[PDB]
């Protein structure tokens, strides 16, 4: 054993997925006013399987002739949650090397 | 438990037995030789102590590692070890004494010839194994905590100089008489003409016979060594009170 | 199994015990003692120097113990790198080739002495623990090195006795034989190709 | 009592400590990946507690290891 | 044993977290009339406990509904009303929910400081004799 | 003489008491919001005496409780925790220097 | 089981680790220079992950070298 | 039941005790070696 | 694939660590020290030339005789490496080749045969052995060569010692020490023959 | 007032460093070695007993004769100090006194007078003279005493050698060296009288 | 092959280029109200290539100017300044590690 | 502007570093050691008194004979310095002055003359010469003085050796070695003359 | 061009590390050390002057005989350097010239010729040879010159030993060692001739 | 030659001058509301030269409101900010001179 795949766990992939998720939410907020755009959601378990997709969000309310299915209340909350979890993933993956370096150097 | 008790006891239960073992090795005939490096000897003492650890009884916990009583314990462990080591040096140097008395009487380095052969006797007869068995037995009958060499042990060990000369003379008495009688016979037989004398001519004659007699000495030296080792081993057991 | 952080710490710690393993488990001990004894045999005291003596022993202990390193590599190193074996099993898989080599290069009498001193009941020689085999190995190797070394001492002692008696024959009792014997001691070693003869026998002595 | 019992007792003390440190490290690793994968039954507070204890536990392991090696290095540099 | 402070501070973090979740549910269901008059939502509150038989951990002993009477409203238009045209609403008081939000957040972050400072004391202990 | 007790002094027992006090202070901070919980105090002099050779003290509130019954003054608890950490750091420095001086004398380095 | 065979085998084992370290450093440097030059399809996470791997790999290389050099010095400077 | 203070104190006490016994052993052996290497 | 700059710095900083080993094993420093050590013992003076002065002259001698190999290393490996003509491994191999040629030139066949058989590798020509098996064969060859040179230099001083000891015995004064009455003549022979120049010249000449 | 634990340890390690000096300057080691040096010199053996065993026997002999004083130090100084009955300062003085008393028992009045005047100090009682002045007087007396014993030990071996030489000359053989013939007779008479045991009695008991 | 150009890579040049870009962006923000001023832009690919192996462009407006001739989109300029500042710091971290990696290789620690 | 405390400590620690040099060159240690060495070789004993005992006796003797100058340093350079009465630079001069005066009392004007010319400094009065010149002159004078005393003590032992050899040659036993028989008489004369107390008293009185 | 302050300190601190090497190779320390060893061997005492004293006298004398060189170094190199009249490059070269001039004056042509041909450099005049080719040649000549001076001093003590050995042999005592009898006269010859002033003055005068 | 004037360079004097410039700017900000006070500046090039080998008035951008005070507060903040940045750089340069100097005399 003793390999980076096992030392880092899955925290090496989660940081990437949280970046992709943040990009999609940023797209949804920007495309909220453009008619005909369908809100895109990212399935977390899919990138989990890709580590070891880009779906559509069904609206809770009807459109108003635009056909745009973006709820700005939902997007802000989902962007806040993703950003908080992204920082935790950096903390988890960052400490993997800090412990790894301390084991090797002994100091 | 408080971890202080566990860690301190093992260091006390290992180093104190090791000190006696190591001190015997540095004074021993073979392990204390100049050929072997201290590092090899150090590892040998570490390995022997670890292996014979089950036979060593637990040291008393009353004496602390950091105390003057513990400091005295370290010193008296060495004195026991040096006592065994000096006995081995006494035997080999007695054979060195045997070599040099023959060489001196041979009108003449001959101690080294006996020293090397006696070292072979020590190794071949498993003398080193017996000494290691003696020191581990010393742990049983002479515990680390209470016990040290008394004044009588010092006097018995100081009296081994007489043991050297008596044993060395006993081994060489037959040869030394032979050396004298042939030289006296050569002197009286050539005394008729004072023109010849001996001087250097006597040097050549004496050394040839002396080397020949040393050939006789090596022929029956093994039996003397066996009796000598029994005397020395008995002294060692007396020190450890076995 | 131990965590990745701990098993990195384990191998790092024992990486510093590599000199310890060499001295008391492999053929480094016997060669150095024989080299040291032969160095004292000639009149030169430190002419070969300690570093050169060690350097020859390190090369010899690698060529001679090469079969041991081969078995350790293919039985312990290779399975561990392929994730076919765990940390403890790989470490045990390395002990067996080295324990077998040490067991065959010791004396029965020494092992019989040590098992008695260790106070463990073992019925057969090939099942003794490594804790008692290591001191038994070095004790036997010391006896072998001393017996081999002092036999090499004998021809150089022969020269000393011959020259000393010759000098004493002429009454030159004050001339030190050691300075006269020194040129002839060196010649005996170079005529017999000593530096190749001792190493060839030392290499072939192990098994 | 013999000296092997003290040595075995010291050995079991070290083995127990290593297992305790290893248990904390594995416990922290599971809690980290459980919260990282997105399980809603894991609290960030418990994860931070878990990795705080494992980091402190391993740091204690490093300190003991260095002292053992330093003592051995001190031991080998002795007259004998 | 070596981390007694962490078990207590961490328990507070888990305890104060539940109180914030309960507050969020009370505010999100302050206008949920639901149906009937006994299935109507009622303000829930966690119960903290301390077993003092060193350190005394804080343990949540379950969620308990408030005993305040339901807020009655006259509305003979809602189809889920009753004979007298009354719809009973949850007994959630906004002012007490705001105070709980302030109290829970501050107390939760206070234990973060204690737990964080506790680690520093442990780290300094490892430097003893160095 | 030449003993660890006579060499370390009271700096070994003091450290344990300071860690005990921090456990008590942290408990009061955690249990601040629990109703009916009474603030717990610790006597350093009595604890140090017990540690050297070898009961419940409650803290009188400065103001009445608002009904819950909890007498934990979180303003005071933080101040005492800050003081306890400083004095604990000094004790570690005092105790740590005892071992360094002992090692210095036994090795002359 | 020959001296040349095992010497090559450990050399192959040693050169494999050196190549592995070299691969991590080149990959780390390649990711850094593409992100730094302005390539859009390079994430900072990939850059930071790679350069953390190289630092750990190079740190192990230096520490292993120090162990080997100290071990070599210990055997050469011993009082034979 | 144990804390880091007890562990660190135990570590420090063991280190001081081990360093004490090694140096005294070294001093006595050096004293012995000095006596052995003297001109009789 | 050339190594990274960090590894290359770490690789040649390790060479400085093994620099003393190279001098005592792969260079001419071994033979020169031994010959002067035996030469010192041949004369009556025990440690008059001193170890540091012996090493100092040996270091200058080993620098002058290894200049062609050092120049070849620079002109085949160092300069292309500094000028980006070859990679790190090619520069390392280009530096080793002149060093191997020097050791093989001053070695013995039997010594090479002894070590190739023990290692267990196929050999058909001398210039195929790995450096791991050439180093122990080279130092063994140097020690034998150094002993032979030391023996020659020892003989003239042995003749003087025998003559002066025999002459004293001719008059009959056996107690007078030959060593004290022979040291001035041993030193004078080393002077009027000018030993400190021809002996160093032979040591330089013996390597080429 | 009493020395701290750190300072007491420093003093303890200091005395261990000076331990070889205390053996050869304060204890009975000097007299025993000098007497045993004469015994080796008296017989025809030059280095045959070797230096190692003589020192080792001397060390064991000293521990035998110093056992009363060492035990007196143990009881008076070590035991109260271990039990923490007395302070370190007075315990050190309690250990110094038995050594001073023993050195007074093996010194002479004339030797003390010379050094006390040499030091240029004022004293009236030999019992409270500084140990710095007692040490040179102690060894000076020890060397003179050892020469007396050695002279008495040298006489019987001189007696044997002169008799053998006279016998050989009287028989007319003026060509044979007396040393070779006399050596077995000296060794035989050294063994059948058990000479070393007699020397032990007159050396160990000489201190009292 | 051991040389600063090979060890520091392009990060020794990128820092200077992004500093130049910050100056070009900052003078566009400051001169936002000056009429007749055309917003200036610096091509990163060209400037980096020029620096590697040894003239700012004009930024086209997305909407017409309101009669002053100034084509500075202050909404866009803030976005570019923020991006350049983050990328400038990232290049500093890359370049800074290049010297630290060399130092630890040289010193062996 | 005396030296700062940090520099004053640095100077004192340096003087302790050269303490063996000060004792073996600037004091009476050398002369006593050489005279003891000649006396030991004068008798038949090679190294019976042993080297450590000889140096141990000399160290106490050289401390006693230099107690007056040691006290003068204390009373003029140490106590004023500790009482804050003299500049540290002045105190160093006040300590060096008695040491220079003592070395001048035991030096020979010929030694000063050759070293002053060797240093090439124009100095006339034999009191303001540098320590760089005085120390080699002093140690040279001590070696010559020790040889004179060594020859003086050697003569009686030469007389005994010649008498014993002559008496043995009178009886015709030329084969008998005079050294073995001479030695007990050499011990005899030295002990009934009270040699050890006599020589150390004369060596103490010699420095004046 | 001029070295930076950090580099100048690094170079200067480097030369302090090689200071012991420059003393025993580039100064008069070696010749004086060798001569005293031979002079000590000539007399019967082998360790009476003591190594520490001999090196101490050698250090004082090498300070006196290198003073003209050191003063030239101070004047030519240091004073322009401290006053910023020359760069660090010029100062180091200006310091090397007087030291090279001293070594060139005490060397031998043949020794220079031997190493010049060994170094493979094209040299037209001796006064411009490289430093690396002068240091081995200078120390070689010093050792040879030291032996010649030692042989001069050995003869007078050898003559005394031969004279006393023959006188003892004439009277028929062939067992008395001449070394014991000769030693008092060897010491006296060194005394009434004032050897410790004559020898040192000649050694200092041998560099002029 | 090795001396501090050649080892430290001008950085030993530059640090001191910027401290003076801090005082000059500080006394301008405090006297912003005092009528009749004229803002004073410090010429760095001239002051540095004087320190190496050994209080001008600032012109107002706009007329004063009537008090007689010519202190432009926003200019003082900008100048103080720049002076503080360069002062830290001067400390960084001068401090590194000693550290590199110590490394040479110590060898590690």
Short mmCIF file of N, CA, C and O in Angstrom, two decimals, chain D:
data_model
loop_
_atom_site.label_atom_id
_atom_site.label_comp_id
_atom_site.label_asym_id
_atom_site.label_seq_id
_atom_site.Cartn_x
_atom_site.Cartn_y
_atom_site.Cartn_z
N UNK D 1 9.38 -13.00 40.11
CA UNK D 1 9.16 -12.33 38.84
C UNK D 1 10.45 -12.26 38.03
O UNK D 1 11.54 -12.14 38.58
N UNK D 2 10.31 -12.34 36.71
CA UNK D 2 11.45 -12.29 35.80
C UNK D 2 11.48 -10.97 35.03
O UNK D 2 10.52 -10.19 35.05
N UNK D 3 12.60 -10.73 34.35
CA UNK D 3 12.73 -9.54 33.54
C UNK D 3 11.95 -9.57 32.25
O UNK D 3 11.69 -8.51 31.67
N UNK D 4 11.57 -10.76 31.78
CA UNK D 4 10.77 -10.85 30.56
C UNK D 4 9.36 -10.32 30.80
O UNK D 4 8.75 -9.74 29.89
N UNK D 5 8.82 -10.52 32.00
CA UNK D 5 7.49 -10.01 32.31
C UNK D 5 7.45 -8.49 32.24
O UNK D 5 6.49 -7.91 31.73
N UNK D 6 8.49 -7.83 32.75
CA UNK D 6 8.58 -6.38 32.65
C UNK D 6 8.72 -5.95 31.20
O UNK D 6 8.10 -4.97 30.76
N UNK D 7 9.53 -6.68 30.43
CA UNK D 7 9.68 -6.36 29.02
C UNK D 7 8.39 -6.57 28.24
O UNK D 7 8.03 -5.76 27.38
N UNK D 8 7.67 -7.66 28.53
CA UNK D 8 6.39 -7.89 27.89
C UNK D 8 5.37 -6.84 28.30
O UNK D 8 4.57 -6.38 27.47
N UNK D 9 5.37 -6.44 29.57
CA UNK D 9 4.46 -5.40 30.03
C UNK D 9 4.76 -4.07 29.33
O UNK D 9 3.83 -3.34 28.96
N UNK D 10 6.04 -3.75 29.16
CA UNK D 10 6.41 -2.55 28.41
C UNK D 10 5.99 -2.68 26.95
O UNK D 10 5.54 -1.70 26.34
N UNK D 11 6.15 -3.87 26.36
CA UNK D 11 5.76 -4.07 24.97
C UNK D 11 4.26 -3.92 24.79
O UNK D 11 3.81 -3.32 23.80
N UNK D 12 3.46 -4.45 25.72
CA UNK D 12 2.01 -4.32 25.61
C UNK D 12 1.57 -2.87 25.79
O UNK D 12 0.57 -2.44 25.20
N UNK D 13 2.29 -2.10 26.61
CA UNK D 13 1.98 -0.69 26.77
C UNK D 13 2.17 0.07 25.46
O UNK D 13 1.35 0.91 25.09
N UNK D 14 3.26 -0.22 24.75
CA UNK D 14 3.50 0.43 23.46
C UNK D 14 2.49 -0.03 22.42
O UNK D 14 1.99 0.79 21.64
N UNK D 15 2.18 -1.32 22.39
CA UNK D 15 1.20 -1.83 21.43
C UNK D 15 -0.18 -1.24 21.68
O UNK D 15 -0.90 -0.88 20.74
N UNK D 16 -0.57 -1.11 22.95
CA UNK D 16 -1.86 -0.52 23.28
C UNK D 16 -1.94 0.93 22.82
O UNK D 16 -2.96 1.37 22.28
N UNK D 17 -0.86 1.69 23.03
CA UNK D 17 -0.86 3.09 22.61
C UNK D 17 -0.94 3.21 21.10
O UNK D 17 -1.68 4.06 20.58
N UNK D 18 -0.20 2.37 20.37
CA UNK D 18 -0.23 2.43 18.91
C UNK D 18 -1.62 2.10 18.38
O UNK D 18 -2.12 2.74 17.45
N UNK D 19 -2.26 1.09 18.97
CA UNK D 19 -3.63 0.75 18.57
C UNK D 19 -4.59 1.88 18.87
O UNK D 19 -5.49 2.17 18.07
N UNK D 20 -4.43 2.55 20.02
CA UNK D 20 -5.28 3.68 20.34
C UNK D 20 -5.08 4.83 19.36
O UNK D 20 -6.05 5.45 18.92
N UNK D 21 -3.83 5.12 19.00
CA UNK D 21 -3.56 6.16 18.01
C UNK D 21 -4.11 5.74 16.65
O UNK D 21 -4.71 6.55 15.93
N UNK D 22 -3.91 4.48 16.27
CA UNK D 22 -4.43 3.99 15.00
C UNK D 22 -5.95 4.01 14.98
O UNK D 22 -6.56 4.31 13.95
N UNK D 23 -6.58 3.68 16.11
CA UNK D 23 -8.04 3.72 16.18
C UNK D 23 -8.56 5.13 15.95
O UNK D 23 -9.54 5.33 15.23
N UNK D 24 -7.91 6.12 16.57
CA UNK D 24 -8.33 7.51 16.37
C UNK D 24 -8.12 7.96 14.93
O UNK D 24 -8.96 8.67 14.37
N UNK D 25 -7.00 7.57 14.32
CA UNK D 25 -6.72 7.98 12.95
C UNK D 25 -7.74 7.39 11.98
O UNK D 25 -8.20 8.07 11.06
N UNK D 26 -8.10 6.12 12.16
CA UNK D 26 -9.13 5.52 11.31
C UNK D 26 -10.50 6.11 11.61
O UNK D 26 -11.30 6.32 10.69
N UNK D 27 -10.79 6.39 12.88
CA UNK D 27 -12.06 7.01 13.24
C UNK D 27 -12.20 8.39 12.62
O UNK D 27 -13.26 8.76 12.11
N UNK D 28 -11.12 9.18 12.66
CA UNK D 28 -11.15 10.50 12.03
C UNK D 28 -11.30 10.38 10.52
O UNK D 28 -12.03 11.17 9.90
N UNK D 29 -10.62 9.41 9.91
CA UNK D 29 -10.70 9.26 8.46
C UNK D 29 -12.10 8.93 7.98
O UNK D 29 -12.56 9.46 6.97
N UNK D 30 -12.80 8.05 8.70
CA UNK D 30 -14.17 7.72 8.34
C UNK D 30 -15.09 8.92 8.49
O UNK D 30 -15.92 9.19 7.61
N UNK D 31 -14.97 9.65 9.59
CA UNK D 31 -15.83 10.81 9.81
C UNK D 31 -15.55 11.90 8.78
O UNK D 31 -16.47 12.62 8.36
N UNK D 32 -14.30 12.05 8.37
CA UNK D 32 -13.97 13.03 7.33
C UNK D 32 -14.63 12.66 6.01
O UNK D 32 -15.25 13.50 5.35
N UNK D 33 -14.50 11.40 5.59
CA UNK D 33 -15.07 10.99 4.31
C UNK D 33 -16.58 10.85 4.37
O UNK D 33 -17.25 10.99 3.34
N UNK D 34 -17.14 10.57 5.55
CA UNK D 34 -18.60 10.54 5.67
C UNK D 34 -19.20 11.93 5.47
O UNK D 34 -20.21 12.08 4.78
N UNK D 35 -18.59 12.95 6.08
CA UNK D 35 -19.07 14.31 5.88
C UNK D 35 -18.72 14.83 4.49
O UNK D 35 -19.47 15.63 3.92
N UNK D 36 -17.60 14.38 3.93
CA UNK D 36 -17.17 14.85 2.62
C UNK D 36 -18.02 14.26 1.50
O UNK D 36 -18.26 14.92 0.48
N UNK D 37 -18.48 13.02 1.66
CA UNK D 37 -19.31 12.41 0.63
C UNK D 37 -20.71 13.01 0.60
O UNK D 37 -21.40 12.93 -0.43
N UNK D 38 -21.15 13.62 1.70
CA UNK D 38 -22.43 14.29 1.71
C UNK D 38 -23.47 13.66 2.62
O UNK D 38 -24.67 13.90 2.45
N UNK D 39 -23.03 12.84 3.57
CA UNK D 39 -23.96 12.24 4.52
C UNK D 39 -24.45 13.29 5.50
O UNK D 39 -23.66 14.04 6.08
N UNK D 40 -25.77 13.35 5.69
CA UNK D 40 -26.40 14.39 6.50
C UNK D 40 -26.48 14.04 7.98
O UNK D 40 -26.95 14.86 8.77
N UNK D 41 -26.04 12.85 8.37
CA UNK D 41 -26.04 12.45 9.77
C UNK D 41 -24.73 12.78 10.48
O UNK D 41 -24.58 12.44 11.66
N UNK D 42 -23.79 13.43 9.80
CA UNK D 42 -22.49 13.77 10.36
C UNK D 42 -22.41 15.28 10.53
O UNK D 42 -22.75 16.04 9.62
N UNK D 43 -21.95 15.70 11.71
CA UNK D 43 -21.84 17.11 12.05
C UNK D 43 -20.40 17.58 11.86
O UNK D 43 -19.46 16.84 12.16
N UNK D 44 -20.25 18.80 11.34
CA UNK D 44 -18.91 19.36 11.15
C UNK D 44 -18.16 19.46 12.47
O UNK D 44 -16.93 19.32 12.51
N UNK D 45 -18.89 19.70 13.57
CA UNK D 45 -18.25 19.78 14.88
C UNK D 45 -17.60 18.45 15.26
O UNK D 45 -16.47 18.43 15.75
N UNK D 46 -18.31 17.34 15.04
CA UNK D 46 -17.75 16.04 15.38
C UNK D 46 -16.57 15.70 14.48
O UNK D 46 -15.60 15.08 14.94
N UNK D 47 -16.62 16.09 13.21
CA UNK D 47 -15.50 15.85 12.31
C UNK D 47 -14.27 16.61 12.77
O UNK D 47 -13.17 16.05 12.83
N UNK D 48 -14.43 17.89 13.11
CA UNK D 48 -13.30 18.68 13.58
C UNK D 48 -12.76 18.15 14.90
O UNK D 48 -11.55 18.17 15.14
N UNK D 49 -13.65 17.68 15.77
CA UNK D 49 -13.21 17.03 17.01
C UNK D 49 -12.41 15.78 16.69
O UNK D 49 -11.36 15.52 17.28
N UNK D 50 -12.90 14.98 15.74
CA UNK D 50 -12.24 13.72 15.41
C UNK D 50 -10.84 13.95 14.86
O UNK D 50 -9.89 13.26 15.26
N UNK D 51 -10.68 14.91 13.95
CA UNK D 51 -9.37 15.14 13.36
C UNK D 51 -8.46 15.93 14.30
O UNK D 51 -7.23 15.86 14.17
N UNK D 52 -9.03 16.68 15.24
CA UNK D 52 -8.21 17.31 16.27
C UNK D 52 -7.57 16.27 17.17
O UNK D 52 -6.38 16.37 17.50
N UNK D 53 -8.34 15.26 17.58
CA UNK D 53 -7.80 14.24 18.47
C UNK D 53 -6.79 13.36 17.75
O UNK D 53 -5.75 13.00 18.32
N UNK D 54 -7.07 13.00 16.49
CA UNK D 54 -6.13 12.17 15.74
C UNK D 54 -4.82 12.90 15.49
O UNK D 54 -3.74 12.30 15.57
N UNK D 55 -4.88 14.20 15.19
CA UNK D 55 -3.66 14.98 14.99
C UNK D 55 -2.84 15.06 16.27
O UNK D 55 -1.62 14.92 16.24
N UNK D 56 -3.50 15.29 17.41
CA UNK D 56 -2.79 15.33 18.68
C UNK D 56 -2.24 13.95 19.03
O UNK D 56 -1.12 13.82 19.53
N UNK D 57 -3.03 12.90 18.77
CA UNK D 57 -2.58 11.55 19.09
C UNK D 57 -1.35 11.17 18.28
O UNK D 57 -0.41 10.57 18.82
N UNK D 58 -1.33 11.50 16.99
CA UNK D 58 -0.17 11.18 16.16
C UNK D 58 1.04 12.02 16.55
O UNK D 58 2.17 11.53 16.52
N UNK D 59 0.82 13.28 16.92
CA UNK D 59 1.93 14.12 17.37
C UNK D 59 2.60 13.54 18.61
O UNK D 59 3.82 13.61 18.75
N UNK D 60 1.80 12.97 19.52
CA UNK D 60 2.37 12.27 20.66
C UNK D 60 3.17 11.05 20.21
O UNK D 60 4.21 10.73 20.80
N UNK D 61 2.69 10.36 19.17
CA UNK D 61 3.43 9.21 18.65
C UNK D 61 4.78 9.62 18.10
O UNK D 61 5.78 8.92 18.30
N UNK D 62 4.84 10.75 17.40
CA UNK D 62 6.10 11.22 16.84
C UNK D 62 7.09 11.56 17.95
O UNK D 62 8.28 11.23 17.86
N UNK D 63 6.62 12.21 19.01
CA UNK D 63 7.52 12.61 20.09
C UNK D 63 8.15 11.41 20.78
O UNK D 63 9.35 11.41 21.07
N UNK D 64 7.35 10.37 21.04
CA UNK D 64 7.88 9.17 21.68
C UNK D 64 8.89 8.47 20.77
O UNK D 64 9.93 7.99 21.22
N UNK D 65 8.59 8.41 19.47
CA UNK D 65 9.50 7.77 18.52
C UNK D 65 10.85 8.48 18.50
O UNK D 65 11.90 7.82 18.50
N UNK D 66 10.85 9.81 18.45
CA UNK D 66 12.11 10.55 18.39
C UNK D 66 12.94 10.32 19.65
O UNK D 66 14.16 10.19 19.57
N UNK D 67 12.29 10.28 20.81
CA UNK D 67 13.02 10.04 22.05
C UNK D 67 13.62 8.64 22.08
O UNK D 67 14.74 8.45 22.57
N UNK D 68 12.88 7.65 21.58
CA UNK D 68 13.42 6.29 21.53
C UNK D 68 14.64 6.21 20.63
O UNK D 68 15.65 5.58 20.98
N UNK D 69 14.58 6.85 19.46
CA UNK D 69 15.71 6.82 18.53
C UNK D 69 16.89 7.59 19.10
O UNK D 69 18.05 7.16 18.99
N UNK D 70 16.63 8.75 19.72
CA UNK D 70 17.71 9.53 20.32
C UNK D 70 18.40 8.76 21.43
O UNK D 70 19.63 8.81 21.57
N UNK D 71 17.63 8.05 22.26
CA UNK D 71 18.22 7.22 23.30
C UNK D 71 19.08 6.12 22.70
O UNK D 71 20.18 5.83 23.20
N UNK D 72 18.59 5.47 21.64
CA UNK D 72 19.38 4.44 20.98
C UNK D 72 20.64 5.02 20.35
O UNK D 72 21.72 4.42 20.45
N UNK D 73 20.53 6.18 19.71
CA UNK D 73 21.72 6.83 19.16
C UNK D 73 22.67 7.27 20.25
O UNK D 73 23.89 7.22 20.07
N UNK D 74 22.14 7.73 21.39
CA UNK D 74 22.99 7.98 22.55
C UNK D 74 23.63 6.70 23.05
O UNK D 74 24.81 6.68 23.42
N UNK D 75 22.87 5.60 23.07
CA UNK D 75 23.37 4.34 23.60
C UNK D 75 24.54 3.82 22.78
O UNK D 75 25.55 3.37 23.33
N UNK D 76 24.44 3.88 21.45
CA UNK D 76 25.50 3.33 20.60
C UNK D 76 26.79 4.12 20.69
O UNK D 76 27.86 3.59 20.36
N UNK D 77 26.74 5.38 21.13
CA UNK D 77 27.95 6.18 21.34
C UNK D 77 28.33 6.14 22.82
O UNK D 77 28.22 7.13 23.55
N UNK D 78 28.80 4.98 23.25
CA UNK D 78 29.23 4.78 24.63
C UNK D 78 30.49 3.93 24.65
O UNK D 78 30.68 3.07 23.78
N UNK D 79 31.37 4.16 25.62
CA UNK D 79 32.54 3.28 25.77
C UNK D 79 32.11 1.87 26.18
O UNK D 79 31.23 1.70 27.03
N UNK D 80 32.73 0.88 25.57
CA UNK D 80 32.39 -0.51 25.83
C UNK D 80 33.57 -1.41 25.50
O UNK D 80 34.45 -1.04 24.72
#
